Amino acid sequence: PPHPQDLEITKLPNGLVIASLENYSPGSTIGVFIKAGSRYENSSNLGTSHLLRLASSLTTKGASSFKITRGIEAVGGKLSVESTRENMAYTVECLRDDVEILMEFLLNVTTAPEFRPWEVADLQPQLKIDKAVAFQNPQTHVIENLHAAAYRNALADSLYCPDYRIGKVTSVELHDFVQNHFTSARMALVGLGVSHPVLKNVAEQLLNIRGGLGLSGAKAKYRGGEIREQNGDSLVHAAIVAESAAIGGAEANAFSVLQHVLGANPHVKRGNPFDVSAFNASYSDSGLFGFYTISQAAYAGQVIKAAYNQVKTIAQGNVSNENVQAAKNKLKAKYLMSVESSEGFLEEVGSQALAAGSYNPPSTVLQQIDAVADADVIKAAKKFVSRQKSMAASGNLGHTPFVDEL
Amino acid sequence: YAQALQSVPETQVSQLDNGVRVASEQSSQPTCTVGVWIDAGSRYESEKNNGAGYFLEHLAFKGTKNRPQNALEKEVESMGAHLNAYSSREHTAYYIKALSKDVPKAVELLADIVQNCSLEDSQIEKERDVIVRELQENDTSMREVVFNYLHATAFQGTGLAQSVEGPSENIRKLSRADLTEYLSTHYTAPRMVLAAAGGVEHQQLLELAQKHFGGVPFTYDDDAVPTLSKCRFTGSQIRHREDGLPLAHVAIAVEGPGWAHPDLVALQVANAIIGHYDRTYGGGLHSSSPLASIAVTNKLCQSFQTFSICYSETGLFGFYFVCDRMSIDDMMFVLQGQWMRLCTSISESEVLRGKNFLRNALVSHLDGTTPVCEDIGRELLTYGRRIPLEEWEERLAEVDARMVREVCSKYIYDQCPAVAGPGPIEQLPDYNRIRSGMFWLR
Amino acid sequence: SHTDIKVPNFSDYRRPPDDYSTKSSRESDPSRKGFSYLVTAVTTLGVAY
Amino acid sequence: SRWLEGIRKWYYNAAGFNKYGLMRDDTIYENDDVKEAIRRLPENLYDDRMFRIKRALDLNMRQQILPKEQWTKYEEDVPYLEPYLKEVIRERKEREEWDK
Amino acid sequence: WLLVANLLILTWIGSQPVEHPFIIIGQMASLSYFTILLILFPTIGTLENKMLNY
Amino acid sequence: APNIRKSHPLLKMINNSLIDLPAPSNISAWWNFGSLLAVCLMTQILTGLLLAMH
Amino acid sequence: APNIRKSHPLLKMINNSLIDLPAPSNISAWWNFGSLLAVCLMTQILTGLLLAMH
Amino acid sequence: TLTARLYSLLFRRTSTFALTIVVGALLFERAFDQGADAIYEHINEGKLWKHIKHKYENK
Numbered sequence A: 001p002p003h004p005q006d007l008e009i010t011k012l013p014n015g016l017v018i019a020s021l022e023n024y025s026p027g028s029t030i031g032v033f034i035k036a037g038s039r040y041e042n043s044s045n046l047g048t049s050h051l052l053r054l055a056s057s058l059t060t061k062g063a064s065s066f067k068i069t070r071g072i073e074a075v076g077g078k079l080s081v082e083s084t085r086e087n088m089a090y091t092v093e094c095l096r097d098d099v100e101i102l103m104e105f106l107l108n109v110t111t112a113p114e115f116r117p118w119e120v121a122d123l124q125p126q127l128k129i130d131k132a133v134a135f136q137n138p139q140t141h142v143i144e145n146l147h148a149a150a151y152r153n154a155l156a157d158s159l160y161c162p163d164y165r166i167g168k169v170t171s172v173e174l175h176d177f178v179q180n181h182f183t184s185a186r187m188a189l190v191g192l193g194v195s196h197p198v199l200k201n202v203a204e205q206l207l208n209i210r211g212g213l214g215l216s217g218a219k220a221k222y223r224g225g226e227i228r229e230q231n232g233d234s235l236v237h238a239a240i241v242a243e244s245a246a247i248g249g250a251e252a253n254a255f256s257v258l259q260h261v262l263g264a265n266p267h268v269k270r271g272n273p274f275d276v277s278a279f280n281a282s283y284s285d286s287g288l289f290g291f292y293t294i295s296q297a298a299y300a301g302q303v304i305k306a307a308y309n310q311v312k313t314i315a316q317g318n319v320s321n322e323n324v325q326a327a328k329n330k331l332k333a334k335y336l337m338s339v340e341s342s343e344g345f346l347e348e349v350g351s352q353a354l355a356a357g358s359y360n361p362p363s364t365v366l367q368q369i370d371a372v373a374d375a376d377v378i379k380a381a382k383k384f385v386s387r388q389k390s391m392a393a394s395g396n397l398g399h400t401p402f403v404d405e406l
Numbered sequence B: 001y002a003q004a005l006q007s008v009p010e011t012q013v014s015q016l017d018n019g020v021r022v023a024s025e026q027s028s029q030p031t032c033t034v035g036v037w038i039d040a041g042s043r044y045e046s047e048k049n050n051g052a053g054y055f056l057e058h059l060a061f062k063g064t065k066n067r068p069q070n071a072l073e074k075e076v077e078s079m080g081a082h083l084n085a086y087s088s089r090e091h092t093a094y095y096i097k098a099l100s101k102d103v104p105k106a107v108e109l110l111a112d113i114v115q116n117c118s119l120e121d122s123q124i125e126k127e128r129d130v131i132v133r134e135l136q137e138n139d140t141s142m143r144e145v146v147f148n149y150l151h152a153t154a155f156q157g158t159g160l161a162q163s164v165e166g167p168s169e170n171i172r173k174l175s176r177a178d179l180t181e182y183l184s185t186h187y188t189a190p191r192m193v194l195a196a197a198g199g200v201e202h203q204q205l206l207e208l209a210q211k212h213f214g215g216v217p218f219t220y221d222d223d224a225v226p227t228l229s230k231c232r233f234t235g236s237q238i239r240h241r242e243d244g245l246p247l248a249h250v251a252i253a254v255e256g257p258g259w260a261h262p263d264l265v266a267l268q269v270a271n272a273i274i275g276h277y278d279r280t281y282g283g284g285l286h287s288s289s290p291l292a293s294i295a296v297t298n299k300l301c302q303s304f305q306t307f308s309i310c311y312s313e314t315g316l317f318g319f320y321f322v323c324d325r326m327s328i329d330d331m332m333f334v335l336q337g338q339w340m341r342l343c344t345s346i347s348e349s350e351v352l353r354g355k356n357f358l359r360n361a362l363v364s365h366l367d368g369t370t371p372v373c374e375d376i377g378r379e380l381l382t383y384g385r386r387i388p389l390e391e392w393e394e395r396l397a398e399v400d401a402r403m404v405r406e407v408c409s410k411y412i413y414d415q416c417p418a419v420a421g422p423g424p425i426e427q428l429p430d431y432n433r434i435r436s437g438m439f440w441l442r
Numbered sequence C: 001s002h003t004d005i006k007v008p009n010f011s012d013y014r015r016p017p018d019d020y021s022t023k024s025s026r027e028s029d030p031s032r033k034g035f036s037y038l039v040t041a042v043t044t045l046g047v048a049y
Numbered sequence D: 001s002r003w004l005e006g007i008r009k010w011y012y013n014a015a016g017f018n019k020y021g022l023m024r025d026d027t028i029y030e031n032d033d034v035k036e037a038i039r040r041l042p043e044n045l046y047d048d049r050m051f052r053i054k055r056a057l058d059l060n061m062r063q064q065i066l067p068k069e070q071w072t073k074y075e076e077d078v079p080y081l082e083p084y085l086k087e088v089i090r091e092r093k094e095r096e097e098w099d100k
Numbered sequence E: 001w002l003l004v005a006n007l008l009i010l011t012w013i014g015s016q017p018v019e020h021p022f023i024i025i026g027q028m029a030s031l032s033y034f035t036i037l038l039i040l041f042p043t044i045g046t047l048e049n050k051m052l053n054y
Numbered sequence F, G: 001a002p003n004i005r006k007s008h009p010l011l012k013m014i015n016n017s018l019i020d021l022p023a024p025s026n027i028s029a030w031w032n033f034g035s036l037l038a039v040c041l042m043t044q045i046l047t048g049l050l051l052a053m054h
Numbered sequence H: 001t002l003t004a005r006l007y008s009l010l011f012r013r014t015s016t017f018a019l020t021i022v023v024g025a026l027l028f029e030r031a032f033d034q035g036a037d038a039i040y041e042h043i044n045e046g047k048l049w050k051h052i053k054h055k056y057e058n059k
């Protein structure tokens, strides 16, 4: 009658948070978020995540690879799987009554994967390309390496199965990796365009595993790594970081505003044909903060340098309490905006319904970002300039400097 | 569900004694997006006028006279709004996205651009060499050049054939003037639409537009919108070979009806049935879309997509694929074959899915504020009003097999298509061959 | 570049006087084909005989 | 009155394909289904089967057979492929039905 | 072999004039022929498969 | 191959000597002589075979 | 190809149907019938062609 | 408008096309012959047996 129906959350006897929210859209979308990811891999089993992420369409026990794909399509369905170093989100979307049917397949894909030894042994050669396409984006390249140079142990592990292991992942490493991370405590049957009483009556079938935290990913030790990739692309990609900020970590929001407090500065600080921005990643027990600078070859040295001086003199008092007001607002924006699209939105009611079990209303989420400002920032920057730095780089580089050259 | 559609907030629309049409959709959403969608484009350009619409889009932000560069941006940045846009062949727009708490501020901004652009002769001489570079980039995006070339030959000789970007020679010589000659000529209320979506209350919008768009039409001309010169479709081909490239692209198509035409529905459903593939998917088992299946089994293409790109009074219903120098043929064959199948022996069980597949994109076509405004921005401009998802629903919730057949055949069977192909295409057979691929040896 | 490219003038050079822009190539040729086909239809015919 | 069990045993030794020393399944003509079946076989059993076939061929090609000892006994015949083959078939029959 | 012989038979019965001693023999074998093919074979066929659990 | 015109041992030959055969674009009548020569070979073989009937 | 037995359009056919042709190791006489059938086709065509000479 | 009427109805569907070749051939035959025969005979008045058949059947 106004379209408002408070998003009910009801933690099952397992640890399976069930978040819905009937927003009345014609097309609703259900999603199974998990605390899985490439953070829980060891020197071996590497990329088993990635592969897994692809084995999405492989036969289950309730429905065949065939049925599933044509099943979902015979409804105008859409199954897909988005994952990050520390979390895999299995979404699915459709409309009307078809949500009910669209489920059977999502249910099976996430709990009854009988990864047949052939299907996978015939699916693995996909990694070669799935990766090959993603790597056309130089940006993804540098980052993959960044985390490598930023860490040493879990998390620093690649997001796209390393080459050497392309066809060595075993059908076993897949079950074993699932049996240990796809467990009630670390899952969330989130969803939209749905009545919660229904989205709940489904978690009943979804009750097939308990093991709270099966393999828990090791804490992430930091490292001041530096790994250059000489490849002459006429234009260098560079990133620098200083470990910091963690999701839920009160010290978070600060950078966010520093993320914005920064940008117009580093950019407007480096004249010529380029691009540069403030880098920020907040992970479960760690994070990162810095800046990537896509810049022409020979003008790569200069670019990063200047970009840096700025993050520098940003800590040494060059931040009007105005810069903060403006930036404090942009986040209010980028936050709210990137919530319009039910997929970037269902991504929010999920992330939280997973890491916390709560739901910070748009009101306080502001009151929290509003909450700090002058108070930090200037300082959040300082943290960068002092701590240890880890750089990543792709490009001609012959003109690009090393961290030991600040 | 159907109830979900129905309970969907109607879109408000009301024009000015000026000419502008002001419409939009309301929700709870703090955020929003708003924009002016001009009936402007490349199609509206001349042999020496080609480019402007672009060279324009590229200065449409670098300021106004009221508030020069550093300030506009600073005023935009500073409030956290995103002012983005484009310019096609018969459509240009400029939308911003703020917190709805800025309707009146965003609106003003809008008006201050579509009406007063700095066009700093010194700003231009820079954006000049910027485009000429930015164009040199658009160039190795074979994924595109293949389409312009398609237009180029598909509508050879007419206005559409000219690429939204325009020749280097024009961008190298457009005058401070010619740009203005473009602005003052096409940027007029009767052809412009103020649309928005989010938490906005129409009236507040109206009044602000009705307030910052203080336009006044004297003559009968000013109040009249010119209808465009018809573009001759020309079944033909254009081949820009180069075995030096990783692979070749191929794009073939038949003339499209034009937005107006009710068949664009059934037709849209058509394209739903063969859809698109792209090696990352996960389906040699795919839904009917054999083109997809077969594309897998016999490793036909890197990726293929079906499209019914349409315009005011014409269109381009075809398909585009990317494939190794070597499997180009088998692909066409299999593909082009599908069109036939499609309009010679298509089944209900097929259309059933097609529909739902469309009804899914139909809905997700409107996902957020920016996108919604797009339709509204568009809808009005090309259709006349706004087509509700409740409507589109019926439109395509009533297309049976026999209807698809009757349609596709009507625009594909024994029609002379236009093919375009850049890259190592030595393997693509001549025209006659891909031509006699239009009729099924029934 | 590639924007600098055009399909040259085939107008009178070739083209049947039912094709010189400003009017649907369609509706027109769906008559032309009849003819070219008409011939073939005939040749086939003549051949049969 | 007469055990199908008792019978099968008959036919089995009667077919005498075990005189060459190859399991039942090592014989089933290789049609589309079987191929896919066998193509799903674990590499263990595959190479096993292969050799058994090559040995079979080699014998056959010599006109001579396998010592009474090496024949495989009915009860010990390993239906190594029947299971895969079956899924296959139903997999197909599932698809064939869906395409209607 | 019932067939191969059933053939060698038809043959003899062919090089033989038409009288009761023959004739019938004839149309008979000239019946087993077909059946052995059209019917027997395919039947003894599936049958043997079942004598193997197939 | 979904082709068939290329996946059939016999059928390929044809769609490989009459269809799909790469031939130079520029070719004068002096290139027909041969295809004609065939038609003769035929007309001869057909007629003569028939004339030998008498 | 230094081979020749494989680099010659005609010559290949032979070294591809009489030499180098993969044939099962185990094959009974019942497989000769055919190669024989040929020899007949020949013996027939040769003799008859010659008998037609008279 | 003949040609258009023709195409749409007769030459479009490869199914139809053929059908008119046939029914057409039947017509072309019947007509071509009578025409030919006439042209011919006329160019030989009073020379053909059909033409003298009468001095034992009048004319």
Ligand code: HEM
Pocket: F041, F044, F045, F046, F047, F048, F049, F050, F051, F052, F053
């Ligand atoms: C390779 C093409 C052939 C050539 C060059 C050819 C040429 C001739 C010639 C010039 C004659 C004499 C005709 C005359 O009196 O003017 C002839 C006669 C004859 N040919 Fe052929 N012939 C050919 C093929 C055949 C074939 C394939 C047959 C049947 C196997 C055949 C059967 C005969 C017969 C029946 C005669 C005798 C009646 C007659 O003289 O017209 N010819 N052929």
Ligand code: HEM
Pocket: G041, G044, G045, G046, G047, G048, G049, G050, G051, G052, G053
């Ligand atoms: C396909 C293999 C052939 C078969 C099955 C075959 C069979 C026969 C038979 C059974 C006869 C009757 C012989 C007899 O009186 O006992 C015959 C006669 C004859 N065949 Fe063939 N023939 C064949 C090929 C040829 C060829 C290639 C020619 C020449 C083109 C030929 C020319 C003749 C001649 C000259 C006669 C008549 C003289 C005679 O009766 O022996 N035959 N052929």
Ligand SMILES: CCCCC[C@H]1C(=O)O[C@@H](C)[C@H](NC(=O)c2cccc(NC=O)c2O)C(=O)O[C@H](C)[C@@H]1OC(=O)CC(C)C
Pocket: F014, F017, F018, F023, F027, F028, F029, F031, F032, F033, F034, F035, F036, F038, F041, F042
């Ligand atoms: C079942 C039917 C199979 C088709 C066989 C048939 C086949 O090669 O048909 C064509 C390609 C062949 N000529 C050409 O390809 C050709 C090549 C370059 C240019 C032109 N044109 C000039 O502008 C051609 O016409 C022509 O010379 O006939 C031959 C030779 C053969 O046929 C002969 O064995 C028949 C004899 C043996 C009775």
Ligand SMILES: CCCCC[C@H]1C(=O)O[C@@H](C)[C@H](NC(=O)c2cccc(NC=O)c2O)C(=O)O[C@H](C)[C@@H]1OC(=O)CC(C)C
Pocket: G014, G017, G018, G023, G027, G028, G029, G031, G032, G033, G034, G035, G036, G038, G041, G042
């Ligand atoms: C210039 C000469 C070219 C050689 C042509 C000649 C060629 O195929 O020669 C062999 C391979 C052919 N049989 C076999 O290959 C073959 C295959 C499996 C097993 C065995 N052996 C059994 O243990 C074989 O013997 C045999 O049946 O002759 C044919 C059929 C043909 O020749 C015939 O067209 C001639 C007729 C047309 C006159």
